[PDB]
């Protein structure tokens, strides 16, 4: 029981922490572009996607090999708890 | 021949157990549906013709194996092992040697392993290799699925499903590449050389 | 000898809908080859000793299958509101609710589980044996839809109110500067707050309520009567 | 039969968990970008398959399920 | 005779079409999902439940018809035409007699099922609009209080669906239309 | 005996093959599920019901033809060429005339004009199905026009367009209008 | 008897495998579903009518071939390769030559003509289906962009697009023109 | 195809009349509530007479 | 693949010319609303969307006979290129 | 497995460049027309889209011949990585 509680607490923790850096690197560049639009008046609502695509695709570029060694380290542990 | 019609109908329900597990039909039929799902099709072409092309390609490497058993084959104890020795020197090629020792315990030149010990490892080795070469096919289509979905998002049309646009492009990327014949050439050259 | 086929086709009728409804017994985890062998073993193992008798015994089975599938519909409806508030479902106007249903199907299955399931099914033949015209007792059936919805809403009550305050505060942020595109700014953060808030009460609260909403064998007379 | 339905569903929930971790981050980054009209199955299904070939789980489930009933050496 | 058991395969594969055609399940299964479309949450109550309750509710209406056909029972085919009389007095009370004779002059047992089912889709679609009406007042009165403030750009759907969902269960909705729909057909309670 | 049972159970898999190619079910079920497509609903009225309704009407029209064929019934293979002249007259009136002469180029053969009738039936079913589609399209933009006239540009129109899409269908009560019109295209009173 | 009829049912087991893989029905079955999904229609014609229309169109070029088998016919073991050349002149006409010679390397035999014909009918049906997909992408984008010309950014265009999709198919009467188009490539 | 053209242009004529009449008016809803249901119900009454006959 | 590369440029050239005419008529009168009111301002933001919708369906009522035949021709041409 | 991480890095590098080239062209027409509408007011929401569609279809003309080659060579590289 205490491992079923631990494995459920860690699956939600890894979802929270792996979707952390791409969702805070697409937030500062969602807010500072609009703060530039508060100084100079622009009425183009479809503007900060041009930076949001480069922000998410460059954050997923440097940490690409890092996600594989957190998914493999958690996926090998849960099967050892399953079988043994 | 009423003692033999049971020996014919049981053979006709025994070949669907063997062809679906212990031949190259396993690796053949999986990639045809993974490339069917990579384009974004559900009912095209069917589930029936994809087992037909894979069965016709499956006997291209099994008919040279089956002819050796037809010429060769309580005296039927040692009669069967040499009739299947042409099938058991093929099953050691495409299986894992450490895995067949796991089933043999739970050299190989001086003694070939047991025939019931390496057929599950052959099945697991072809499901694993079909999943590996099936992951490769998905990637080009995923790139042309993310490009059109981010070009329409460069415009203001966030309420627009890109499946109505990506489906023309995905099957010109498969016919300008000549995809269907290209996969079958590599599937034949992975078993029988030219 | 030859009448055991009818005595196992009367057991199959009651057992089969329950199998159809429960999350650890459906067609997703039980293929066609071993399926029709288990339900004759269980039906022969629970026997206490004309076309419409198989329909009457099927109606008692659909009432029993909904009562045994009572605590998993609450967790699935919990997941559909947690997944709906963060986004990811407005393309029809899921992936999250299948995790809470798979979790509650294991945390129910460890402590007790199949013992109270076959205890309910074995006490069902102590009150509604066939050829006595049992019936699913209509006047409590009418509030069954309301009960699951009420339980799901109270269970999910934190995450909706927190995501509602995140929408009032982000709506207040746009009144100071309307050039923000605050519809899509909230769409990046509500899927992280709907995980962080449910992390604080996933462990201590949620495995208790599955053992609280579980239907037991002591309440079979309030749901099944006899006409005879 | 019921005690092996309980034990196989116990193994299958553990096996189920990593992929759900993949699907809940994929559906989060497709909502960070404005791509709410995009099914995440068509992106996750490639990267859900690498988790089964870099982990070689076909030689791990069959390796463990035999060891539950028999032993080596 | 194995043809008599093949006729049982003519029963196990045809009974979902007779329940979906001539049984009052057609009226319950339409209105149950119609109020679900009225709320704004398309995964709750999760159609397996909405089909379970709509099948058990219709198995209280069909039981006084199926029971009298059992206590009663072209020469021996003249036994069943009196057995279906309990279903035939049922198929005249809820179907219109401008469609009953129309499939005849161009009451028979085959001439009333295509007219009863078309009278139940008609009698269900004008109940679901009356059900539709309060909700439109709700999401038109919560979307207009945002424009009175400086909230001209925020989406009102994510605010409309909780304020529509906590009101329907607190006013006991799903036990008010499940009673009011079965009161049309049988002497409930 | 068994030699006729293997000639009948291999024929029993061909019974929906005539329904999907030779009868008029291929026009009834298309308009019946395009009404569901045009109204904006997804599983109302749950097309397992709609196939049984369109099969009832198709069987109703089909019966006068199957009745006299059983009255009538190599040199016994030539009894089938004149046994189905009542069926052959039926798909002459509704098929394309100048398509059959393209099929026989390669009193006509029954294998020739059988795809021509289904081709002209899917063409007529898509023409009637487009006719129904046109009014609702106007219903949609008369909701989005008034919603853009107010300050509700972020509010989606699908929650207000769907109520007035199905009161236009019940005040016009089109479930009886389509069902009477498709019978009147074939039968007569 | 029983064995002389079970071998005929084993013949009828093989008959859907040949009619689904090694004849023209492979080409006919793809295009009716590719235009079913092209018009924005999920399932609404059938899966049974389209498989019966394409089969009744498929026997128009098959019965001229298979009538010579009724004309012609271990004596029967060598004659079946003799009196089966009429199907091999059909499987050598539409199959690519280097795909045939590759299967014969890894008059030509029939077993190499079966997958080389089958792997070419899928590609040619995909090439026909792309040209059928093209006039509907234009109507999908021009009715979804005049809403963006207005303030209609929360508006799914798939309910205004769908009537123009099929009125541009009954104006071009694209079912009988497609059946007449697929016949002149064979007759 | 003339009944396909007439029915295909009465829809665009009604969009210009109905959706464009409170444009020039607003450039009061109870008097405009009863007008729209008369025209949409009569256009749907006409298109079945052009459809099923 | 000359017919493939001709039908792809014809499809995108017909998208640019079919979606450009009601887009320019949606902003000619949109500029004739804002530029006209430089004297006696009385400006309200939601006002020109009704006239822009009437101006869109007006020019669609003119070009409805031309927009059909430019799709009827390309539709008959793209199937004739595929079959024969 | 060294080629699985090469096909994954080539795919992630390719999406950023292929969806980045029309994104900057959709960004500058979102910029300059708004900076032309913040000083010479002429306030309009349709005028940026009316030129953004022209800039996107123009660069899809000039890059349609290049996108098919950068996808055809990557598609041919993948199948030979997979089979042999």
**What is the DSSP-derived secondary structure letter of residue G45?**
S
- List subunits contacting chain A, requiring 3 or more Cβ pairs under 8 Å: B, C, D, J
Cα distance between residue B150 and residue B152, in whole Å: 5
Instruction: For CA atoms F132, F134, F136, F139, give the dihedral sign.
Output: negative
Alpha-helix runs per DSSP H in G24-109: 25-38, 50-58, 63-72, 75-79, 85-91, 97-105
Contacts of C9 (CB under 8 A, 6+ apart): C54
The answer to whether C18 and C64 have CB atoms below 8 angstroms apart is yes
- 3-state class (DSSP) for residue E186: coil
Cα distance between residue D29 and residue C188, in whole Å: 8
Q: Is residue F155 within 8 angstroms of chain C, CB to CB?
A: no
Q: What resolution, expressed in A, was reported for this entry? A: 3.5
Tokens of G100: 């045939």
- What's E18-65 look like in SS3? HHHHHCCHHHHHHHHHHHHHHHCCCCCCCCHHHHHHHHHHHHHHCHHH
Q: Which of E3, E113, E143 sits opposite F56 (nearest CB)?
A: E113
Tokens of E139: 């999401």
**What is the DSSP-derived secondary structure letter of residue E187?**
-
Q: Which residues of E touch F176 (CB under 8 A)?
A: 99, 118, 122
Cα distance between residue I69 and residue F12, in whole Å: 48
- What's chain F look like in SS3? CHHHHCCCCCCCCCHHHHHCCCCCHHHHHHHHHHHHHHHCCCCCCCCHHHHHHHHHHHHHHHHHHHHHHHHHCCCCCCHHHHHCHHHHHHHHHCCCHHHHHHHHHCCCCCCCCHHHHHHHHHHHHHHHHHHHHHHHHHHHHHHHHHHHHCCCCCCCCHHHHCHHHHHHHHHCCHHHHHHHHHHHCCCCC
Instruction: For CA atoms G169, G171, G176, G177, give the dihedral sign.
Output: negative
Q: Which of D65, F7, F125, F43 is nearest to G49 (CA)?
A: F125
**What are C226's strand-pairing partners?**
C134
CA distance to C174, G25, G102, G152, H35, per residue, from B56 (Å): 65, 17, 14, 54, 68
Cα distance between residue E100 and residue E92, in whole Å: 8
Tokens of F45: 């009225």
The answer to whether C38 and C16 have CB atoms below 8 angstroms apart is no
Q: B66 exposed, middle or buried (CB, 10 Å; 0-12, 13-18, 19+)?
A: exposed
Q: Which of C170, B56, B17, F126 is nearest to G39 (CA)?
A: F126
The percent helix, strand, coil of chain G (3-state, each to 5) is 70, 0, 30
The answer to whether G177 and I80 have CB atoms below 8 angstroms apart is no
Instruction: Report CB contact under 8 Å: H20, I57.
Output: yes
Cα dihedral: B5, B6, B9, B11 (round 10) = -110
Cα distance between residue D25 and residue A14, in whole Å: 9
Q: Backbone dihedral region of J44: left (phi > 0), alpha (psi from -120 to 50 degrees) or beta?
A: beta
Q: Which residues of G touch J45 (CB under 8 A)?
A: 151
Cα distance between residue F45 and residue E31, in whole Å: 10
Cα distance between residue B166 and residue G123, in whole Å: 18
Q: How far is CA G75 from the centre of its chain?
A: 36
Instruction: Report CB contact under 8 Å: C149, E169.
Output: yes
* CA angle centred on E3, ends E1 and E8, rounded to 5°: 110
Tokens of G164: 């123009």
CB within 8 Å of chain E, chain C residues 10-29: 21
Contacts of G127 (CB under 8 A, 6+ apart): B175, I82
Specify the DSSP element, H or E, that contains C226. Answer: strand C225-226
Cα distance between residue E81 and residue E67, in whole Å: 16
Q: How many residues does chain F have?
A: 189
Tokens of H3: 């009944």
Q: Which of D20, D10, D5 is nearest to D51 (CA)?
A: D20
Q: How far is CA G8 from the centre of its chain?
A: 27
Q: Which of G63, G57, G52 is nearest to G90 (CA)?
A: G63
Instruction: Report CB contact under 8 Å: B143, J15.
Output: yes
- What's chain H look like in SS3? CHHHHHHHHHHHHHHHHHHCHHHHHHCCCHHHHHHHHHHHHHHHHHHHHCCCC
Q: Which of F184, F179, F175 is nearest to H53 (CA)?
A: F184
Rg (CA), chain J: 19
Q: C153 exposed, middle or buried (CB, 10 Å; 0-12, 13-18, 19+)?
A: buried
Instruction: Report CB contact under 8 Å: F156, C93.
Output: yes
Longest dimension (CA), chain C: 84
Strands (E) located in chain E: none
The answer to whether E177 and E31 have CB atoms below 8 angstroms apart is yes
HSE-CB at G130 with a 13 A cutoff on CA atoms is 24
Q: B63 exposed, middle or buried (CB, 10 Å; 0-12, 13-18, 19+)?
A: exposed
CB-CB neighbours of C1 under 10 Å: 4
What is the pairing mode between strands C134-135 and C225-226? antiparallel
Residue of I nearest to F138 (CA): I57
Q: Which of G170, G160, F172 is nearest to H15 (CA)?
A: G160
Tokens of J11: 């795919």
**What is the DSSP-derived secondary structure letter of residue B112?**
P
- 3-state class (DSSP) for residue G115: helix
Cα distance between residue G48 and residue F59, in whole Å: 18
Contacts of C148 (CB under 8 A, 6+ apart): C70, C73, C74, C77, E45, E49
Angle between helices E157-170 and E25-39 (to 10 degrees): 130
Cα distance between residue F130 and residue F185, in whole Å: 18
Q: How far is CA F135 from the centre of its chain?
A: 21
Specify the DSSP element, H or E, that contains C135. Answer: strand C134-135
Q: Is residue F44 within 8 angstroms of chain C, CB to CB?
A: no
The answer to whether J27 and B151 have CB atoms below 8 angstroms apart is no
- 3-state class (DSSP) for residue G41: coil
Tokens of B35: 């490339």
Q: Which of A12, A30, A34 sits opposite C198 (nearest CB)?
A: A12
String of DSSP letters for B155-173: TT--S--THHHHHHHHTTT
- 3-state class (DSSP) for residue B191: coil
Q: How far is CA H37 from the centre of its chain?
A: 9
HSE-CB at B179 with a 13 A cutoff on CA atoms is 26
The answer to whether F149 and F160 have CB atoms below 8 angstroms apart is no
Cα distance between residue G157 and residue G160, in whole Å: 6
Cα distance between residue G49 and residue G51, in whole Å: 5
The answer to whether F111 and F88 have CB atoms below 8 angstroms apart is no
Contacts of F120 (CB under 8 A, 6+ apart): F94, F95, F96, F99, G176
The answer to whether G171 and I72 have CB atoms below 8 angstroms apart is yes
Tokens of D65: 């399920």
String of DSSP letters for B31-98: HHHHHHHHHT-SSSS-SSSHHHHHHHHHHHHHHHHHHHHHHH----SSHHHHHSHHHHTTTTTSS-HH
Q: Which residues of J touch D50 (CB under 8 A)?
A: 4, 8
Backbone φ, ψ for residue G97 (5° rounding): -75, -40
Sequence-separated contacts (24+) of G42-46 with Cβ below 8 Å: G44/F30, G44/F33, G44/F34, G44/F37, G45/F26, G45/F30, G45/F122, G46/F20, G46/F26, G46/F29
**What are C77's strand-pairing partners?**
none
- What's A26-61 look like in SS3? CCHHHHHHHHHHHHCCCCCCCCCHHHHHHHHHHHHH
Q: Which of C25, C19, C14, C22 is nearest to C61 (CA)?
A: C14
**What are C225's strand-pairing partners?**
C135
Q: Is residue J46 within 8 angstroms of chain G, CB to CB?
A: yes
Cα distance between residue H12 and residue G72, in whole Å: 65
Q: Is residue I4 within 8 angstroms of chain B, CB to CB?
A: yes
Cα distance between residue A48 and residue F51, in whole Å: 50
Cα distance between residue E34 and residue A24, in whole Å: 40
CA distance to B22, B80, B114, C31, C215, per residue, from B19 (Å): 6, 19, 19, 21, 48
**What is the DSSP-derived secondary structure letter of residue A11?**
H
**What are E175's strand-pairing partners?**
none
Residue of B nearest to A46 (CA): B156
Q: Residue-wise over C158-186: b if at least 16 C-beta within 10 A, else e?
A: ebbebbeebbeebbeebeeeebbbbbbbb
The answer to whether J45 and B149 have CB atoms below 8 angstroms apart is no
Q: Which of E185, C228, I49 is nearest to F141 (CA)?
A: I49
Q: How far is CA F84 from the centre of its chain?
A: 22
Tokens of J79: 């199948």
Cα distance between residue D35 and residue D52, in whole Å: 27
Backbone φ, ψ for residue C135 (5° rounding): -155, 145
Contacts of E35 (CB under 8 A, 6+ apart): E128, E131, E173, E177
**What are C134's strand-pairing partners?**
C226
Q: Which of F54, F74, F58, F75 is nearest to F66 (CA)?
A: F58
The answer to whether C179 and A38 have CB atoms below 8 angstroms apart is yes
Cα distance between residue E73 and residue E78, in whole Å: 12
CB within 8 Å of chain F, chain C residues 31-90: none
Residues just before a chain gap in chain H (C–N exceeding 2.5 Å) are 27
Tokens of C30: 């039980």
Cα distance between residue D27 and residue D40, in whole Å: 6
Q: Tokens 């309009």, residue? A: J44
- 3-state class (DSSP) for residue D56: coil
* CA angle centred on E167, ends E162 and E170, rounded to 5°: 125
Cα distance between residue C205 and residue C100, in whole Å: 13
**What are C135's strand-pairing partners?**
C225
- 3-state class (DSSP) for residue C225: strand
The answer to whether G171 and I70 have CB atoms below 8 angstroms apart is no
Instruction: Report CB contact under 8 Å: J71, B182.
Output: no
The percent helix, strand, coil of chain C (3-state, each to 5) is 65, 0, 30
């Amino acid at each position: 029981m205490d491992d079923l509680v631990f494995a459920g607490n860690k699956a939600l923790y890894l979802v929270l922490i792996l979707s952390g850096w791409p969702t805070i690197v697409a937030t500062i560049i969602g807010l500072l572009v609009g703060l530039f639009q508060t100084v100079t008046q622009l009425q183009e609502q479809t503007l900060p996607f041009g930076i949001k695509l480069l922000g998410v695709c460059l954050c997923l570029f440097l940490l690409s090999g890092w996600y594989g060694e957190v998914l493999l380290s958690y996926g090998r542990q849960v099967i050892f708890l399953a079988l043994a | 021949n009423d003692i033999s019609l049971i020996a014919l109908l049981a053979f006709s329900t025994l070949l669907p157990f063997i062809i679906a597990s212990g031949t190259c039909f396993v690796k053949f039929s999986i990639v045809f549906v993974m490339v069917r799902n990579a384009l974004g099709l559900q009912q095209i072409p069917s589930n029936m013709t994809l087992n037909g092309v894979a069965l016709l390609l499956s006997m291209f490497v099994m008919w040279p194996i089956m002819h050796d058993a037809y010429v060769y084959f309580s005296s039927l104890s040692k009669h069967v092992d040499e009739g299947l020795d042409g099938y058991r020197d093929y099953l050691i090629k495409y299986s894992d040697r450490e895995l067949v020792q796991f089933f043999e315990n739970a050299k190989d030149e001086i003694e070939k392993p047991s025939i019931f010990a390496l057929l599950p490892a052959y099945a697991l080795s072809e499901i694993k290799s079909a999943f590996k070469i099936g992951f490769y096919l998905y990637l080009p289509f995923v790139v042309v699925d993310l490009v059109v979905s981010s070009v329409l998002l460069a415009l203001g049309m966030m309420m627009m499903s890109p499946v109505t646009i990506s489906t023309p492009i995905k099957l010109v990327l498969f016919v300008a590449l000549d995809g269907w014949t290209l996969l079958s050439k590599g599937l034949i050259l992975q078993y029988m050389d030219i | 000898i030859h009448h055991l086929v009818a005595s196992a086709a009367l057991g199959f009728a009651r057992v089969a809908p329950i199998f159809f409804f429960l999350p650890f017994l459906n067609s997703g985890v039980l293929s066609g080859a071993p399926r029709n062998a288990i339900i004759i073993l269980v039906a022969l193992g629970v026997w206490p000793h004309m076309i419409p008798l198989v329909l009457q015994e099927a109606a008692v089975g659909v009432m029993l299958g909904c009562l045994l599938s009572w605590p998993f519909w609450v967790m699935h409806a919990l997941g559909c509101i947690i997944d709906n508030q963060r986004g990811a479902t407005l393309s029809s106007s899921s992936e999250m609710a299948n995790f809470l249903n798979m979790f509650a199907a294991v945390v129910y299955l460890q402590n007790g589980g199949l013992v109270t399931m076959v205890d309910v099914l074995n006490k069902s033949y102590q009150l509604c044996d066939p050829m006595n015209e049992c019936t699913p007792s209509l006047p409590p059936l009418l509030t069954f839809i309301n009960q699951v919805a009420q339980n799901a809403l109270v269970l999910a009550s934190p995450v909706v109110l927190v995501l509602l305050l995140s929408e009032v505060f982000l709506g207040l942020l746009s009144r100071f500067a309307p050039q923000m595109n605050a519809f899509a700014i909230s769409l990046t953060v509500k899927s992280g707050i709907a995980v962080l808030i449910m992390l604080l009460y996933f462990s201590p609260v949620l495995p208790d309520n599955v053992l609280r909403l579980s239907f037991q064998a002591t309440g079979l007379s309030s749901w099944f009567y006899e006409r005879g | 039969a019921l005690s092996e339905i309980k034990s196989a569903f116990k193994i299958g929930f553990y096996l189920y968990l990593p992929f759900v971790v993949v699907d809940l981050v994929v559906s989060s980054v497709l909502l960070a970008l404005g791509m709410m009209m995009m099914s995440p199955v068509t992106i996750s299904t490639p990267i859900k398959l690498v988790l089964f070939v870099a982990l070689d789980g076909w030689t791990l489930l069959s390796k463990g399920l035999i060891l539950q009933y028999m032993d080596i050496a």
